[PDB]
Design a protein around this nucleic acid. Structure first.
Ligand SMILES: [Mg+2]
Ligand SMILES: [Zn+2]
Lengths: 620, 1061, 49
DNA sequence: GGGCAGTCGCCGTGTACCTCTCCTAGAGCAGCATGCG
RNA sequence: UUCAAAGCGGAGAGGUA
DNA sequence: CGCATGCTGCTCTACCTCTCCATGACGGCGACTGCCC
């Protein structure tokens, strides 16, 4: 039930490139071609009629308004003006329409010529240096060696070689009919059109069947490329460009600085250079200029289009105002600061804030303290809804004015808005999944976030300057899922190893160690008998025994002493068969060949406090 | 303390530029001649007739202008044949001038030029080892400016030469092309058979073929020519305009190779090349007097300051100017010319402006307090135009070399990517005229230190054969050295010798550290990392309302404050006749009057106050050199950055946990730790093609309830309290659409309030310069007083940072056996794991000093006099305080540093005594009022339609990809999808979500975000045919291409979410 | 591993039992190693360069 | 032909937040202050 | 009946965790 | 008493070439290149 299922990529034919642009109008002509390098008008902030910002091609600048101003109103739908032929519709369509530029001479795509694998060189059975020399007008190439002895197909000639061959072909004495053709331009279109993929593949297979040596991998690569082109039903000559497309004008906008100066993009300069060189070359071709200048113009146009596609890949980098390079089309997508890693795999979001963190004791784990100045901003729509429904206000404008005026009712509404609504807290270097956690907020006074001390090692937090970010979930699914999968009170163990992660760490372990240790001095009240642990705690609370004294208590349960003597000691067989075995830390008294009658433990009031606290927490 | 002027690198460099830096560049370019040789221009660059500045320092500061002068050079134009000489004076440019403190004022901002540590010119030898081959040696010859030369020895015994980055070629070609016969190069070399091997292997060359081959290898593809090779060599190495060794380059070449060439000649010659080849041969053959070089040694490194960099910029501008002059001079056949109409000063003006405003060596001044300002001018950088790059600097450049001793501080650096790349000059170091750092020593004769014989300054290479003793050795009568074994340094190693064999002794024990690190008492009891932290954090403190001196200072405070130029001392030795908040006057003994004016509540680069107050009263006897008035961060004479407060070391009920700080409420209502911050706002009235802009109070769509405090001219009044969203200046623009004006008056940003203290304004037709197209400028200054509060950062001098978490009423704090509640409680868990033992010494000595009213001073490394000097002094002081006061609870012998403390909530004493004292704490510039931000909905980006970023423009928080991974590991699917689409860039789902939340319904399903469509358009524009397809249901039907860029729902889609009504 | 020693005084060199031997190889064509191993003495006296 | 050492060029090198400054050359055209008889 | 006037890109330098 | 000339602000467009702007990073991997059989 989704809109689409997969994404497919392929080579672009000139028909497709012209079809992306070239829309139609209710008349006898099409509009989608860019012909002049003007961007905007200097006197009035308006775009020209045939340029990089035109309105007949790319759409109107202001929605439901024409260039001449004759038309207006949303009544006019799908009707084009007459004085200037600008369709009347929304201006957002400006970031869709493309347009195109028609080249007076073919140029080669630099991705398919200058690559780590070069596909033109592989297809043509030629080294990269020879192809690069034929392009850029450094040498010639023979297209038909007919009726000659020292000339072969796809052989690189030179200026002097071509002149000396011309000295013989132009004599027309004999034995030179069927004039051979040599061409110092690209002529890559002719060489790639002459390909006959099916029989080339058959011949390559027939050769690869017999003999291998150690260097048949070249023929394997050629066969792979040929089979790819056969299967895709593409044409190799599409690697040489004849038209190019133009990006919509909102993706290369004009921005105005503070002092009235313009900061134009780097794509506009490259497009301007391409258009200017193309127009000049077409003009020269019209007048039938000498060929040695037309070739210079063609080489310059090749270099311009190459610099537009990718800057500094083959030749020299094109520098702009300063000596810094311009940003081409490939720099938009390729880097770490390119589109992929900066805008698609991570973005900026709404309903978010950031502040410093302080320590909050007396908080429970799963609770956090949020300042009152951030909550009124992150929770605005819920406050507005509650103000409209209960405490009937009227409209949204009155609710916003009430919030702005800082009425006392605002905080009463907010306190009941935020209860039961979880919030997600995050710290900067998120190294594992416990760097984002969900809490329940409590409104505090101040400008710092309060964090429970028991979650610091998970976040790797510390209260000497650290900062945290806050996000809120909006829908029911996000809320239920944050409560049920991410709440900070259900993150006991770690995913790397099953060891516990929420334990008293720094100042609580010191307190437990002091409370439960032993002290040879300060032992007032040692050797006193108590019934149950609560009596001992009550006797210590009102000062009558020390925190480190040794006392006997009555405790029927399981004990675990350190430095214990597992062998019974001081067995006194008393009367009536009753036996009272006295250990180092226990005084069990057992009946005759029967069960246990009583037990006593020699311990310390601090240990009684510790164990009573644990037992009370578990049983309640 | 023999300390001379601390900021003297900048002053010496600028004085050198003025004296002989501009003359040398102006006179190296003067005779400009055209090709016919008929006209000549001479620049008599010796007068310069500098014109006095039109604006004072204060006028430039308050007007937001530039402090500069004008340069005029006399020129003469000479016509050959027909005698015709014209004389005149031409305008060359505007030179910004250096103020009395070593800084520049550019566009109303204080700027400083940083010093740069680079590699010195000369010849450097190195030995490289192959994977399987022998050792092969190479030499590199590097000039101040020009082409580099490289010699290399092969595995077979062959010598090869490389020029710049051309191909390698045998040395015989180069030596014969230079014009040397076989006999002289045979005699000069010491081992001629080693070179004879190369001669035999590569074939003898004559001059003609030598130049032929040299031309062929340097510039391939052209027909060889003898004159071509001659011109190429002359332009490459022997041209003063294209090659320059420098004075230092000639000095280093002569020093290493042992030559005798004159100091005036600054281009390469034949003897240098012959000597370099001979040295390479000897190093290969292990002659005995040859050695490879270390490039990190401070004897191979140089310092460049403002003079040299300005000289280079002037040279470039002058080259451009000469090009313009030569182009313009020949365009006219008839003379009809004057030297004034020939020169155009635009390129030179542009070059100077670019150097002083947009370079990466001119930096915005650090001005939080006088200490930061002082240490910003003594900083050394290894990066810049002519140094290193961040990706190329590695482990070897960021280390400590044994040659930094006494020249670069080993403590003060940044932490992070800049650690080891920026350093600080030590206390006693100074730079000589070649560019090398020196340091002073005293002479030792027969074991006796001669403290009366003018200490000598020595560079890193000089003090390698001597045995140098440290500055902590103890003498008996400022004479003979006591002891039997003495530590010394010999050839970058630490040894011990008898004290009849040392040569020099360092001046002071603090000669090794900088000025910021010299202000930490009891430093030798601290770790080095925490010392770095404390020294760095001492420069982020904020000047307080009433400053106060430390009780346990170190002795360098009065010298660190005299360089900022804010303390006034009387030169008179007389009487004081008039004292006022803004003026002081002192009369001598019949020696006229001296009057001083004081700055009042000014503003620094970082929005801090710059007040100045008097100390004296009327009719006071005053001596020479006595302090008369002092600045905003100094008590009488000396620096005062913090306050002395009562401290106890113990844990509270969890409020001390992991560096948090618990303070008392006395620090709030006693106005301790409160400061003044001043901000500046600006508005501009410009003109537009539609029309001009007018500043007036007739603003549309506003009521009289919002125009109370405007002065019937549209500008607020001095002394008004402004809260958030209040109009300051009222402006209207002439929009095109009755009333045709629109309101965009400037208002205070959200979160700002205070008093209006200044409304200075400037306009045309009054003598004020304005940027083009503007009519008037209005500047408003707003001040406020800030108190300490929960979330602020506090610090000490020993590296202990913290954030305040609670402010207790004074009846809850623990109190002493006399009833005095404490001021701060600190956790003792943070001391033993980080090894700041000096803070306890400081606390105990401050306690004794408070009880005695003494104000002790202790200098670092104080244990050369005894075995445990600090402990004994502290114990003796505490015992003396106990005997003088009469209270026995002050000091106890069982627990020296600990006394009894009670609980303010219950009244019961704690089980064991705790440590209390007086601590000197500072308040840093990181305040929580500037770190809190929140957003619900605001502006969006233009291309991607994602929320903007930034606190100042209602920006959103970034959800990077690490957080995406964390949400994927949880199993979260709906939180992630809500974050990615509805809250970022789903242009239609944002409004639907907001309206659903307000109305109380369910949030609808999202669509495709805009960034994916942007990426598809960008990929299509690269001639790639990419599309999205929907699969066919039946068998032979074709898959259908889906059109993403076409909304099917003809419903409202605004650019930003809006509330329905 | 290797370690180079340096003289603590200046003067002339006297051998006691060290017999040098030029041991050539692929790298050290001029490396003359010791063969027996004895005592090396440095007689005192200032040295002029 | 086979098999290389040797060499040249392109790819890659932590996250989140805060403060400050500055941002295209050349040529063409029209209107106001200044020294002289 | 209509909204609507406050948002902008790049480069360099420094800092906090 | 009046007449002739340099300076400043606005506008309008167009781009290619060098003496090459550097020659202190380090590893991996693939594509030429001269040399010895
Ligand atoms: Mg921290
Ligand atoms: Zn129209």
């Amino acid at each position: 039930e989704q809109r689409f299922d997969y994404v497919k990529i392929a080579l672009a034919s000139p028909e497709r490139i012209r079809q992306w642009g070239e829309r139609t109008l209710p008349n006898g002509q099409v509009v989608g071609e860019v012909t002049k390098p003007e961007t905007i008008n200097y006197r009035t902030l308006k775009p020209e009629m045939d340029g990089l910002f035109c309105e007949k091609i790319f759409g109107p600048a202001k929605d439901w308004e024409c260039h001449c101003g004759k038309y207006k109103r949303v009544r006019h739908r799908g009707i084009v003006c007459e004085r200037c032929g600008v369709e009347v519709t929304e201006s957002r369509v400006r970031r869709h329409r493309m347009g195109f530029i028609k080249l007076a001479a073919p140029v080669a795509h630099v991705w398919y010529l200058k690559g780590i694998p070069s596909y033109i060189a592989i297809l043509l059975d030629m080294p990269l240096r020879d192809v690069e020399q034929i392009v850029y007008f450094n040498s010639y190439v023979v297209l038909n060696p007919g009726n000659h002895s020292e000339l072969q197909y796809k052989q690189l000639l030179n200026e002097d070689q071509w002149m000396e061959i011309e000295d013989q072909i132009y004599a027309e004495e004999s034995d030179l009919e069927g004039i051979e053709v040599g061409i110092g331009a690209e002529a890559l279109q002719q060489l790639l059109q002459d390909l006959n993929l099916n029989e080339e593949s058959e011949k390559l297979r027939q050769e690869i069947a017999e003999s291998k040596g150690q260097k048949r991998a070249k023929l394997i690569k050629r066969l792979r490329v040929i089979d790819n082109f056969i299967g895709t039903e593409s044409r190799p000559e599409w690697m040489v460009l004849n038209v190019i497309p133009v990006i919509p004008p909102d993706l290369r906008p004009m921005v105005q600085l503070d002092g009235g100066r313009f900061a134009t993009s780097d794509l506009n300069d490259l497009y301007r250079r391409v258009i200017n060189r193309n127009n000049r070359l077409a003009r020269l071709q019209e007048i039938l200029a000498p060929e040695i200048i037309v070739r210079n113009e063609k080489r310059m146009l090749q270099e311009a289009v190459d610099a537009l596609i990718d800057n500094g890949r083959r030749g020299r980098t094109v520098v702009g105002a300063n000596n810094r390079p311009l940003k081409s089309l490939s720099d938009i997508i390729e880097g770490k600061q390119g589109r992929f890693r900066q805008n698609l795999l991570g973005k900026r979001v709404d309903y978010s804030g950031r502040s410093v963190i302080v320590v909050g004791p007396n908080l429970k784990i799963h609770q956090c303290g949020l300042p009152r100045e951030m909550a009124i901003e992150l929770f605005q729509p819920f406050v507005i809804h509650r103000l409209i429904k209960n405490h009937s206000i009227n409209n949204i404008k009155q609710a916003k004015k009430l919030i702005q005026k800082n009425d006392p009712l605002i905080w009463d509404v907010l306190e009941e808005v935020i209860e039961g609504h979880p919030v997600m807290l995050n710290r900067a270097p998120t190294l594992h999944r416990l760097g984002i956690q969900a809490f329940e907020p409590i409104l505090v006074e101040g400008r710092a976030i309060q964090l429970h001390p028991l979650v610091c090692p998970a976040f790797n937090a510390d209260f000497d300057g650290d900062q945290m970010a806050v996000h809120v979930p909006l829908s029911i699914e996000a809320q239920a899922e944050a409560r049920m999968l991410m709440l900070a009170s259900g993150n006991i163990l770690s995913p790397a190893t099953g060891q516990p992660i929420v334990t008293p760490s720094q100042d609580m372990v010191l307190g437990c160690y002091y409370l439960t240790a032993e002290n040879p001095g300060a032992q007032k009240g040692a050797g006193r008998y108590f019934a149950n642990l609560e009596d001992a705690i009550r006797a210590f609370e009102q000062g009558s025994v020390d925190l480190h004294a040794w006392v006997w208590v009555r405790f029927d349960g399981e004990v675990e002493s350190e430095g214990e003597s597992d062998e019974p000691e001081s067995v006194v067989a008393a009367d009536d068969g009753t036996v009272t075995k006295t250990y180092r830390f226990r005084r069990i008294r057992e009946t005759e060949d029967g069960q246990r009658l009583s037990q006593y433990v020699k311990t310390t009031p601090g240990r009684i406090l510790f164990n009573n606290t644990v037992q009370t927490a578990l049983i309640h | 303390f023999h300390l001379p002027d601390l900021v003297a690198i900048q002053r010496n460099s600028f004085r050198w530029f003025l004296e002989e830096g501009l003359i040398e560049e102006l006179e190296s370019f003067s005779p400009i001649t055209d090709y016919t040789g008929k006209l000549e221009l001479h620049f008599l660059g010796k007068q310069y007739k500098l014109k006095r500045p039109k604006y004072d320092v204060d006028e430039a500061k308050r007007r937001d202008g530039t402090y500069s002068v004008q340069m005029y050079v006399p020129t003469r134009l000479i016509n050959k044949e027909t005698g015709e000489i014209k004389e005149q004076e031409v305008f060359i440019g505007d030179l910004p001038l250096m103020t009395d403190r070593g800084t520049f004022i550019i566009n109303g901002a204080e700027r400083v030029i940083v010093n740069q540590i680079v590699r010195s010119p000369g010849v450097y030898y190195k030995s490289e080892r192959d994977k399987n081959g022998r050792l092969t040696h190479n030499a590199s010859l590097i000039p101040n400016r020009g082409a580099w030369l490289k010699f290399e020895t092969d595995k077979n015994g062959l010598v090869w030469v490389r020029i710049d980055k051309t191909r390698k070629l045998s040395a015989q070609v180069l030596l014969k092309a230079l014009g040397l016969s076989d006999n002289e190069i045979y005699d000069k070399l010491r081992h001629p058979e080693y070179y004879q091997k190369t001669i035999d292997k590569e074939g003898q060359f004559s001059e003609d073929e030598a130049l032929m081959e040299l031309y062929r290898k340097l510039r391939p593809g052209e027909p060889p020519t003898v004159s071509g090779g001659q011109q190429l060599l002359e332009s490459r190495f022997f041209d003063p305009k294209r090659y320059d060794l420098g004075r230092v380059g000639r000095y280093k070449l002569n020093k290493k190779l042992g030559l005798n060439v004159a100091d005036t000649v600054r281009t390469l010659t034949s003897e240098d090349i012959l000597a370099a080849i001979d040295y390479l041969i000897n190093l290969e053959l292990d002659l005995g007097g040859c050695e490879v070089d270390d490039i990190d040694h401070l004897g191979n490194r140089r310092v460049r300051s403002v003079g040299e960099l300005l000289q280079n910029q002037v040279r470039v501008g002058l080259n451009r100017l000469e090009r313009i002059i030569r182009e313009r001079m020949t365009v006219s056949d008839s003379d009809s010319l004057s030297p004034a109409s020939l020169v155009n000063p635009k390129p030179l003006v542009a070059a100077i402006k670019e150097f002083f405003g947009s370079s990466q060596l001119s930096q915005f001044m650090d001005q939080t307090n006088p200490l930061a300002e002082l240490t910003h001018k003594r900083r050394l950088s290894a990066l810049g135009p002519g140094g290193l790059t961040r990706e190329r600097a590695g482990f070897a450049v960021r280390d400590i070399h044994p040659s930094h001793y006494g020249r670069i501080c080993p403590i003060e650096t940044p932490e992070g990517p800049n650690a080891g790349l920026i350093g600080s000059l030590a206390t006693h170091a100074r730079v000589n005229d070649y560019g090398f750092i020196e340091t002073p020593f005293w002479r030792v004769e027969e074991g006796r230190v001669r403290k009366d014989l003018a200490p000598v300054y020595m560079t890193a290479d000089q003090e390698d054969d001597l045995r140098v003793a440290p500055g902590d050795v103890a003498t008996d009568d400022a004479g003979y050295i006591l002891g039997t074994t003495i530590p010394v340094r010999y050839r970058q190693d630490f040894t011990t010798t008898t004290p009849e064999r040392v040569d020099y002794v360092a001046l002071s024990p603090v000669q090794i550290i900088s000025v910021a690190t010299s202000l930490i008492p009891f430093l030798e009891h601290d770790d080095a990392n925490r010392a770095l932290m404390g020294s760095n954090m001492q420069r982020q403190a904020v000047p307080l309302l009433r400053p106060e001196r430390p009780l346990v200072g170190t002795g360098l405070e009065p010298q660190a404050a005299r360089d900022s130029g804010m303390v006034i001392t009387s030169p008179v030795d007389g009487t004081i006749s008039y004292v006022d908040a803004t003026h002081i006057e002192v009369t001598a003994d019949t020696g006229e009057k001296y009057g001083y004016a004081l700055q009042k509540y000014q503003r620094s680069n970082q929005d801090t106050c710059l007040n100045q107050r008097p100390i004296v009263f009327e009719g006071d006897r005053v001596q020479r050199g006595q302090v008369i008035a002092d600045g905003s961060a100094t008590e009488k004479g000396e620096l005062a950055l913090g306050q002395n407060i009562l401290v106890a070391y113990m844990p509270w009920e969890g409020y001390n946990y992991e560096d948090a700080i618990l303070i008392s409420e006395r620090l709030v209502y006693d106005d301790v730790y409160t400061s003044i911050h001043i901000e500046k706002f600006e508005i501009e009235a410009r003109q537009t093609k539609l029309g001009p802009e007018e500043i007036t109070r007739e603003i549309p769509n506003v009521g009289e309830d919002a125009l109370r405090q405007l002065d019937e001219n549209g500008i607020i009044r001095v002394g008004a309290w402004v809260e958030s969203g209040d109009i300051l200046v009222g402006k209207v623009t002439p929009k095109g659409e009755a009333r045709d004006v629109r309101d965009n008056s400037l208002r205070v940003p959200n979160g700002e309030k205070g008093r209006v203290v200044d409304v200075r304004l400037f306009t045309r037709e009054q003598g004020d310069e304005l940027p083009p197209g503007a009519n008037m400028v209005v500047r408003v200054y707003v001040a406020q007083k800030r108190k300490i509060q929960v979330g602020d950062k506090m610090a000490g001098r020993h590296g202990n940072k913290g954030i305040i978490s609670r402010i207790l009423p004074c009846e809850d704090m623990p109190y002493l056996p006399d009833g005095t509640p404490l001021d701060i409680v600190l956790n003792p868990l943070g001391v033993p794991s980080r090894m700041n033992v000096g803070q306890v010494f400081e606390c105990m000595l401050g306690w004794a000093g408070q009880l005695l009213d003494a104000r002790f001073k202790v200098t670092p490394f104080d244990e050369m006099y005894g075995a445990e000097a600090s402990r004994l002094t502290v114990n003796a002081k505490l015992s003396e305080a106990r005997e003088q006061t009469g209270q026995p609870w002050v000091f106890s012998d069982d627990e020296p540093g600990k006394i009894q403390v009670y609980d303010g909530r219950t009244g019961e004493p704690f089980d064991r005594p705790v440590t209390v004292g007086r601590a000197y704490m500072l308040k840093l510039v990181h305040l929580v009022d500037d770190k809190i931000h929140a957003r619900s909905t605001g502006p969006y980006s233009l291309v991607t339609q994602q929320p903007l970023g930034g606190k100042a423009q209602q920006g959103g928080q970034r959800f990077g990809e690490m957080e995406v991974w964390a949400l994927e590991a949880y199993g979260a699917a709906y939180i992630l999808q809500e974050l990615l689409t509805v809250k970022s860039d789903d242009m239609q789902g944002r409004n639907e979500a907001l309206n659903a939340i307000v109305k109380g319904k369910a949030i609808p399903r999202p669509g495709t975000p805009e960034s994916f469509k942007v990426l598809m358009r960008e990929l299509q524009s690269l001639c790639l045919d990419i599309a999205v397809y929907k699969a066919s249901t039946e068998d032979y039907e074709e898959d259908k291409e889906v059109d993403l860029m076409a909304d099917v729902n003809q419903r409202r889609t605004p650019s930003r979410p809006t509330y329905e009504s | 591993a290797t370690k180079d020693v340096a003289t603590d005084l200046a003067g002339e060199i006297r051998f006691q039992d060290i017999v040098p031997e030029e041991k050539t190889d692929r790298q050290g064509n001029t490396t003359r190693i010791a063969q027996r191993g004895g005592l090396l003495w440095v007689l005192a006296g200032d040295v002029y360069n």
